[PDB]
Amino acid sequence: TVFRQENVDDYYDTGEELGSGQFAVVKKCREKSTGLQYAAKFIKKRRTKSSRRGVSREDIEREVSILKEIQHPNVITLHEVYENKTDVILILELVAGGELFDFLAESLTEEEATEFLKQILNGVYYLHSLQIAHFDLKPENIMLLDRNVPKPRIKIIDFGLAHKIDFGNEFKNIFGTPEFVAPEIVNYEPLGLEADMWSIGVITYILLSGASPFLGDTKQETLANVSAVNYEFEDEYFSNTSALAKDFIRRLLVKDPKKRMTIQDSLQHPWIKP
Numbered sequence: 084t085v086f087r088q089e090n091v092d093d094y095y096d097t098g099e100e101l102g103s104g105q106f107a108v109v110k111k112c113r114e115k116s117t118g119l120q121y122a123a124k125f126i127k128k129r130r131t132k133s134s135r136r137g138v139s140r141e142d143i144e145r146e147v148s149i150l151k152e153i154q155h156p157n158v159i160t161l162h163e164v165y166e167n168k169t170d171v172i173l174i175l176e177l178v179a180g181g182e183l184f185d186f187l188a189e190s191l192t193e194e195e196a197t198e199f200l201k202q203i204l205n206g207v208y209y210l211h212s213l214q215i216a217h218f219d220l221k222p223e224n225i226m227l228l229d230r231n232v233p234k235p236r237i238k239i240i241d242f243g244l245a246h247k248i249d250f251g252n253e254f255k256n257i258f259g260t261p262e263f264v265a266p267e268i269v270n271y272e273p274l275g276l277e278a279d280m281w282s283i284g285v286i287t288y289i290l291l292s293g294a295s296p297f298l299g300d301t302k303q304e305t306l307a308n309v310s311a312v313n314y315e316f317e318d319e320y321f322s323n324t325s326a327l328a329k330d331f332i333r334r335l336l337v338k339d340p341k342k343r344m345t346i347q348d349s350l351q352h353p354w355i356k357p
């Protein structure tokens with residue numbers, strides 16, 4: 084699919100940089116015709132077929148196709164797509180309260196954790212209902228609308244690894260951040276919606292404790308820890324955490340994807356259920 088090839092600078096003015104990654108940079112922007120504000124994600128294109136640099140058209144089109152499907156309060160939305168010879172430029176909904184990752188750098192109570200968690204689960208429920216696996220859930224990819232309120236509202240971002248799961252699983256060597264990936268990702272096995280639920284377990288552990296359950300001193304150690312389900316609830320961190328909260332985590336950090344809680348299970352779990 085081809086995108087708008089007019090110069091994006093004819094329609095938008097850019098400002099503060101919001102984030103920067105391997106082949107993408109995200110800039111605050113403002114649409115000239117409406118005065119409305121967005122985030123422009125510039126994705127660097129592959130310059131040749133066999134290059135390892137830039138993002139393949141196939142990967143870019145997948146992210147765009149998924150984003151086009153999405154409309155939910157807890158997920159980023161897509162406004163427009165432009166492209167030129169060097170970049171595809173996604174004009175995305177602006178979320179200006181910063182990463183959940185940075186908010187955490189400022190442990191939560193179980194109430195604070197569950198208030199974030201419920202919104203995350205609601206967003207993931209929407210996605211999984213559409214058979215969309217995110218595959219890169221982590222605090223850096225959870226953005227707050229406003230960080231200076233008692234109960235910040237959040238939105239899931241970064242669909243760069245997201246896949247449609249029309250057949251129950253995808254077998255593609257999809258692979259995110261070692262701390263957050265499920266054992267089936269580590270082992271290069273077929274992947275489905277279940278991998279997201281593991282990531283939610285890791286996120287929940289971090290929300291409650293300020294500590295990462297599988298983090299080793301090197302990437303290979305972290306990955307080895309993940310595959311072995313080498314984690315425990317340290318008393319120093321979890322002494323005043325409820326057994327029900329631990330139960331929620333324990334039922335997500337399960338090696339066999341088939342035995343892992345689904346998104347629907349997680350919403351009905353007694354720690355979450357109203």
Ligand SMILES: O=c1c(-c2ccc(O)cc2)coc2cc(O)cc(O)c12
Pocket residue numbers: 101102103104105107109122124159175176177178179226240241242243
């Ligand atoms: O999506 C984002 C955002 C993003 C998008 C929209 C917002 O409103 C806020 C941040 C920021 O940094 C990134 C950095 C990346 O490497 C990849 C991304 O997808 C993003």
